């Protein structure tokens, strides 16, 4: 996929694969573009 979830991706330079709560709320999110760095590279999961 290239508009839903690629992986592996780089959350703000943290690196991740599947979704990730990262301290969210009983859930998590996924990264759209490969590198995240905050470049609208995600969506909540």
Own/partner long-range contacts of 15-19 (Cβ < 8 Å, ≥24 apart): 19/45
Backbone angles phi, psi at 11, to 5 degrees: -60, 105
Q: How was this structure determined?
A: NMR
Alpha carbon separation from 19 to 10, 15 (Å, rounded): 12, 11
- Identify whether the C-beta of residue 7 lies closer than 8 Å to the C-beta of residue 31: yes
1-45 under CATH 2.10.10.10, yes or no? yes
How far apart are the C-alpha atoms of 23 and 2, rounded to whole Å?
Answer: 25
Tokens of 44: 């909540």
- List the chain domain ranges: 1-45
22: left (phi over 0), alpha (psi -120 to 50) or beta: left
How far apart are the C-alpha atoms of 35 and 38, rounded to whole Å?
Answer: 8
Q: Report CA torsion sign: 16, 13, 28, 7.
A: negative
């Amino acid at each position: 996929d290239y508009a839903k979830c690629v992986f592996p991706f780089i959350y703000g330079g943290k690196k991740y694969e599947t979704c990730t709560k990262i301290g969210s709320m009983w859930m998590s999110w996924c990264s759209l573009s490969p590198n995240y760095d905050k470049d609208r590279a995600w969506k909540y999961c």
